[PDB]
């Protein structure tokens, strides 16, 4: 089943940005040496991406939590990970993450991939838990706590075993642009490595699609699930996590933009310009080009909108003499007819 | 995931309705479909021809809406003495009151009793609060346009995707720098084909350096890359001296 | 879908054969596998090469099968030699893409192999 967890606390995170990255290959073509422009949804550029700790001290004894709250899912997200011992395990999508709709679920078993598609009782604090000791053989024996119960579920992926741990700064970097469209659940995904890094560092890559998953169910929210090397029963303060939560992931919500790509001649996205973010920008997209030199050029035109729709017509005249007939004292016989006129 | 065979599907009891918009049905096999979808409900004989782009009526505006670029081909089958019962077979419910229209293909079960008044029914019938989904008296001795007819719309998408439905045409021997008319997976042209040594990621299928025409192609039976080139052309120019000082 | 896979025909038993996972461009891997099955039977590992070279081979597939690489083509294959008819089986080549440290191989394409007097 599942394990009840501490609150949150709706501890305050601080925030970073993507300078310029976040792009991948919307379409299926190969072009070559070329500039494009692609009406889709990308990450804008230096956009504001909320970022998570794996494991928050709120204080140095010890007091480690959990950060992985509950966060939205509108028109897919970006999903950026720092992290060299694979705290990050799966992800959970749906609406209300429960058995009253329907859901669905990614995540790695130990050493296998798993993919569902049901209607899970998901917990409150769905999580994977891992913990060793020098005696025995131990060697991060884990407890699986996502869900409770699933029943009729369609979809079934299972792969092979294989991930070794550490059971000293290469810090790995894997983005994700998950988008679920047309009943589909497009998973770009890009494996990285870097080093000598504390927060996410400023670079450029191309997102190379992975994989698409039959799913065709309503998604409006989503969740992570965090490998814990720690146990709710016995739950030591300080070092029983990995560096103090060092490790962290960041999350990013798309907008539908227009994107000048750059393909070089190996077929590479290399350079991306983005056209509705400066003048300058939309000078670039204007001329498809990079490089713009001295002058003065037109983009577009501006238009004033109208704010408030009005229609009047003239109202003047006097009251209307109806008073006098239905709330006559007295009415005529029906012989001797009464007809008021009204103008 | 399929090959699919709707000639034979053609030939059954010469079904009054077969019609395809955006796709001919003769020539239907021969193009093949990246998805196919199946979308099957009841309806009566004078709001058949609500089923169509760009219609109007109660079903189109309130229970089923096509989009005005609809690309498909609806069909129906009498089904007088399969869904009409003597009695009434009330077990379909049509809307008939929407607080707004709908969508192309847009299916957001409502059950909420709509106010016809300003006082909130509150899910409460009453003055002025009526329940949209009205049941239908179908019967035999019905008339026919009130008599029920079986629909299935079949939808397709002709995306620039690796198709997965299509026809059972068989695919010949490749032929090489010879300028032929090449058909790969729906994608039908004219030229000469000829070994490319660019390189293609591996979700990557076609090529286009110009935008308009692709210059490239990955057949599917064997993964090599082709590249395409036009199959040559050119004016005729005469070069004559005067009539009478020769021919 | 990535990955697409053919090659391979009927033979007699005690030939040899020469399978295939043809290439669908350049990939990244670590580990590049010959799978296979049989009804009635559960699926088995057939041979496994490193990015580096080394190989595994199982059991029964010892001293008759050989894999190549070529990063060439990018194509890897393998030559069967000394076929019984218990090497009858659909066949299947599964990948190392890494994916959260490793996962999502693709050998969900397979060839029919059948060999039998």
């Known amino acids: 089943q599942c394990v009840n967890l501490t609150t949150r606390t709706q501890l305050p995170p601080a925030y970073t940005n993507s300078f310029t990255r976040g792009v991948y290959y919307p379409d299926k073509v190969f072009r070559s040496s070329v500039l494009h422009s692609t009406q889709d949804l990308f990450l804008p550029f230096f956009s504001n991406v909320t970022w998570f700790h794996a494991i928050h001290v709120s204080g140095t004894n010890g007091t480690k939590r959990f950060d992985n709250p509950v966060l939205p899912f509108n028109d897919g997200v970006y999903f950026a990970s720092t992290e060299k011992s694979n705290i990050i395990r799966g992800w959970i999508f749906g609406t209300t993450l429960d058995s009253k709709t329907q859901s669905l679920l990614i995540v790695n078993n130990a050493t296998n991939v798993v993919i569902k598609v049901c209607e899970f009782q998901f917990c409150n604090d769905p999580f994977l838990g891992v913990y060793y000791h020098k005696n025995n053989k131990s060697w991060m024996e884990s407890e699986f706590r996502v869900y409770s119960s699933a029943n009729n579920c369609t979809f079934e992926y299972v792969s092979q075993p294989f991930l070794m741990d550490l059971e000293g700064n290469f810090k790995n970097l894997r983005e994700f642009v998950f988008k679920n469209i047309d009943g589909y659940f497009k998973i770009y995904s890009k494996h990285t490595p870097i080093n000598l890094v504390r927060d996410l560092p400023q670079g450029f890559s191309a997102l190379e699609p992975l994989v698409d998953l039959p799913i065709g169910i309503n998604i409006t929210r989503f969740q992570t699930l965090l490998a814990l090397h720690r146990s709710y029963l016995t739950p030591g303060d300080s070092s029983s996590g990995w560096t103090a939560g060092a490790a962290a992931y960041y999350v990013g919500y798309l907008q539908p933009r227009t994107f000048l790509l750059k393909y070089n001649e190996n077929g590479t996205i290399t350079d991306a310009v983005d056209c509705a973010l400066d003048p300058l920008s939309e000078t670039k997209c204007t001329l498809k080009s990079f490089t713009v030199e001295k002058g003065i050029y037109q983009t577009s035109n501006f238009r004033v909108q109208p704010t408030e729709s009005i229609v009047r017509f003239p109202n003047i005249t006097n009251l209307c003499p109806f008073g006098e007939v239905f709330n006559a004292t007295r009415f005529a016989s029906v012989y001797a007819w009464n007809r008021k006129r009204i103008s | 995931n399929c090959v699919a065979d709707y000639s034979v599907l053609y030939n059954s009891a010469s079904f009054s309705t077969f019609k395809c918009y955006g796709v001919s049905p003769t020539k239907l096999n021969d193009l093949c479909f990246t998805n196919v979808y199946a979308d099957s409900f009841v309806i009566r004989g004078d709001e058949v021809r609500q089923i169509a782009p760009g219609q109007t009526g109660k079903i189109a505006d309130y229970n089923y809406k096509l989009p005005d670029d609809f690309t498909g081909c609806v069909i129906a089958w009498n089904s007088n003495n399969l869904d009409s019962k003597v009695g009434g077979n009330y077990n379909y419910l049509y809307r008939l009151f929407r607080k707004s229209n709908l969508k192309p293909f847009e299916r957001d079960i409502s059950t909420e009793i709509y106010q016809a008044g300003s006082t909130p029914c509150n899910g409460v019938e009453g003055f002025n609060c009526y329940f949209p989904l009205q049941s239908y008296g179908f019967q035999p001795t019905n008339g026919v346009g009130y008599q029920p007819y079986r629909v299935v719309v079949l939808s397709f998408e002709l995306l620039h995707a690796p198709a997965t439905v299509c026809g059972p045409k068989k695919s010949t021997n490749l032929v090489k720098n010879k300028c032929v008319n090449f058909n790969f997976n729906g994608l039908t042209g004219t030229g000469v084909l000829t070994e490319s040594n660019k390189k293609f990621l591996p979700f990557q299928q076609f090529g286009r350096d110009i935008a308009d025409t692709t210059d490239a192609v990955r057949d599917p039976q064997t993964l090599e890359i082709l590249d395409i080139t036009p199959c040559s052309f050119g004016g005729v120019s005469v070069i004559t001296p005067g009539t009478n000082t020769s021919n | 879908v990535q990955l697409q896979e053919s090659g391979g025909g009927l033979v007699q038993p005690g030939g040899s054969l020469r399978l295939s996972c043809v290439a669908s461009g350049s990939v990244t891997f670590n580990s590049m596998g010959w799978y296979r099955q049989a009804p009635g039977k559960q699926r088995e590992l057939v041979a496994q090469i490193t990015a580096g070279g080394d190989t595994h081979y199982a059991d029964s597939v010892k001293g008759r099968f050989t894999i190549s690489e070529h990063r060439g083509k990018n194509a890897v294959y393998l030559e069967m030699h000394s076929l019984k008819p218990e090497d009858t089986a659909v066949y299947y080549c599964?990948?190392?893409?890494?994916?959260?440290?490793?996962?999502?191989?693709?050998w969900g394409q397979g060839t029919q192999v059948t060999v039998s007097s």
């Open positions: 599964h990948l190392q893409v890494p994916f959260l440290g490793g996962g999502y191989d693709y």
